[PDB]
């Protein structure tokens, strides 16, 4: 509809956009679980790992 | 880095699409780093703790 704005522009923000659904979801998967793997590690004291930078 | 609320229009037009591409790169990079913690997911798995 814009003169300026093609499909061009909005295929590649479309396309970004789908990037973006993608590999957050991929996150949290990981997460939640890692997340249960924090609170293991907090008993251990391995919470902090090492992180000297 | 102030408020984008003010030029709504103007901002989102060029912030919006550039701040999914980066957020495309951020969160590619989160999966590496969970990548490292799949290792520990994977002792949790293999060993069956549970």
């Keep these: 509809m814009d003169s300026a704005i093609s499909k061009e522009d909005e295929e590649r923000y479309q396309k970004l956009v789908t990037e973006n659904e993608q590999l957050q979801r991929l996150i949290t998967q990981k997460e939640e679980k890692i997340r249960v793997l924090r609170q293991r590690l907090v008993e251990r004291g391995d919470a902090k790992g090492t992180e000297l930078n | ?50």
Excluded at chain 2, 6 to 35: G, H, P, S, T, W
């Design chain 2, 1 to 50: 880095g102030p408020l984008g609320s003010r030029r709504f229009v103007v901002d989102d037009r060029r912030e919006l699409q550039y701040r999914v591409e980066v957020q495309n790169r951020v969160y590619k990079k989160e999966i590496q780093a969970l990548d490292a913690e799949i290792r520990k997911l994977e002792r949790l798995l293999e060993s069956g703790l549970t």
